[PDB]
Each structure stands twice: as C-alpha cells, then as structure tokens.
C-alpha cells in the first residue's frame, strides 16, 4: 500500500495534535507522555517517531492501554487490540 | 501469458479510429458529448484536423 499514499491515521492524528500542546514527542528523547491517548479506531497505521505514547485502543468492549516502543513503528494499531480468545 | 485478440476494454472514451478491410473503409465513431450533433461537430473538426497531415 506504500504506492499512491501509504499512511492513514486521521483521528489518531487529531488526538496526537491534542497531545502536541507542549511537545509531540518530548521535544521539551522520550519520557512516556503520561497524558493517556485513547483512540476509538484501530484501522490506523503507525507513523515513524510516535514513540513513548500511551495508546488506549478499542477492542469492542473497552479501551486497551499499551505503551509503544521502537519495534512497533511499521505496524497498523489493530494488531494490538485482540478479542482475547486465549483458550 | 494469454490475452484475447478483441480487448474490448472500458473505463475510457475516444474517437475509435478503425479500418474495415472487408469493404476497404475507415471507421471513426463518436463518444464525448451527450448530443449527436455536438459529436458531429467534434468529428467534423477531427476530420479537418485529419487532413492537415
């Protein structure tokens, strides 16, 4: 999907710009960004940078809080919001 | 690695230049404007522009 426009994260970006009132990524490298970020859609992709952000993702029953680290940068956020069919 | 000889494609429009060897005749057709006469105007201009070669 890299061809002809590779990234979709608009509502996540609206919340990210809400976080970006003093620093998007600790420009003031990262300090965990204690204000929680709670998205309402997991179809979003993940953009480079975006590190140390507390993302709360919807599972259809709740919001799942997961801290992003360096490995999950080229992913789509719905991969981290399962339906918990453990057994 | 196979394709039909008659592509008969779509998602486009044109003047459709074509020739018929059976009767020794060229064929151009109309597709752009809604009315027939506006297309007759466009292809008449295309015929005049064809004769500039």
């Amino acid at each position: 999907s890299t061809w002809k426009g590779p990234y979709v994260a608009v509502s996540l970006l609206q919340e990210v710009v809400a976080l970006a009132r003093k620093h998007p990524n600790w420009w003031n490298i990262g300090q965990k960004a204690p204000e929680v970020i709670n998205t309402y859609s997991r179809a979003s992709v993940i953009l480079p940078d975006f590190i140390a952000c507390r993302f709360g993702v919807h599972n259809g029953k709740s919001f799942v809080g997961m801290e992003v680290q360096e490995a999950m940068v080229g992913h789509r956020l719905g991969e981290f919001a399962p339906t918990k069919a453990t057994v | 690695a196979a394709r039909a000889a008659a592509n008969a494609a779509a998602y486009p429009v044109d003047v459709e230049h074509s020739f018929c060897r059976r009767t020794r005749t060229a064929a151009l057709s109309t597709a752009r404007y809604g009315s027939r006469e506006a297309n007759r105007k466009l292809l008449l201009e295309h015929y005049n522009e064809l004769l500039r070669a």
């Binding site: - | 020794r24 060229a26 151009l28 597709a31 292809l43 015929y47 004769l51």
Partner: protein
C-alpha cells in the same frame, strides 16, 4: 443516396413476425410506383430479409425457499431478431418512412435503426488546397436509449461523408 437498416428485437415470435411483415409492407409501399406516368428505383440486389439466431443463455434458480439445495430449476430469456434492408435516393419518402414508424406503435418490440447516408461536407479552403479517393466514410454517430422515458424505438444513424 440513403441506406436504411432496421433491426428488431422481441420475445414472442408472433410480435416480431408481425413487425417484420408490416414494415416490409411499409417499405414496398414507400417506394411503390403507384402509376406509370413519370417513366431510379432501388430493387438493387443488395436487398434482403436476413433472419437470425439468438443469444443462448440459461439462468437457473433454487426452487425452494430455505434449505432445499437439491431444489433447482432452469430459466431462460429469448430474444428474436430480424434485419430489414433497403436503400433509396430521394429524401421525402425516407421521411415518410421515419414518420410512418413514428406513428404505428408496436407491442413489446424494440426498433433499432441504422441510417447510413450521404451528406455534404464543408472544408476550410487550406485543406482543400493542400489536397491539390478511398471510402473513408467515417462519422458513426451514437445516441443513448434509456433512463429518460423511452421504451426503445431508438434510431442510431451513422453518416457517410463526401468531399472529393
């Protein structure tokens, strides 16, 4: 110098048969020498009544409403075709034809009509000068036939050009 082709579409062979016969009556009337006294008739051996086969396609259905996947039945549409051929040299009887098919209404039966004909062409004098032989009769007009209240007596009418 006008050529007419009438194509006709139907579902019951009765109606397309009556349609073919009545338009044949119209053509033979339309160029009829009703009296001798003026004597450029076109029964040239172009003239035909070519019949045609159809487009064989079967479209089947589940008989049952719910489970019933055993329950199949075959169904089917028919299209019966004829083409009507003539040509002539003066336009006033061609207009009698077109107004004749404007009046007589035909039931359930499509009329698609082809009217290749000669019509004269102006040129800018530059290309006539730079002319100084083949067919090159290429206009091929096109018109819509639906979504604007017409049950398809559509007339398509390609044109043939002449500029020597």
């Amino acid at each position: 110098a006008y050529s007419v082709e009438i194509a006709v579409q139907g579902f019951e062979k009765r109606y397309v048969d009556m349609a073919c016969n009545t338009l044949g009556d119209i053509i033979i009337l339309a160029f009829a020498p009703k009296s001798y006294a003026a004597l450029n008739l076109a029964f040239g051996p172009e003239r035909r009544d070519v019949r045609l086969p159809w487009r064989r396609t079967r479209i089947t259905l589940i008989r049952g409403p719910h489970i019933d996947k055993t329950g199949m039945e075959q169904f089917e549409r028919r299209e019966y075709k004829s083409v009507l051929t003539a040509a002539t040299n003066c336009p006033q009887e061609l207009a009698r034809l077109l107004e004749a098919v404007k009046l007589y209404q035909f039931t359930g039966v499509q009329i698609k009509m082809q009217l290749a004909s000669a019509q004269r062409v102006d040129l800018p004098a530059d290309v006539s000068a730079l002319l100084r032989x083949x067919x090159x009769x290429x206009x091929x007009x096109x018109x819509x036939x639906x979504x604007x209240x017409x049950x398809x007596x559509x007339x398509x009418x390609x044109x043939x050009x002449x500029x020597x």
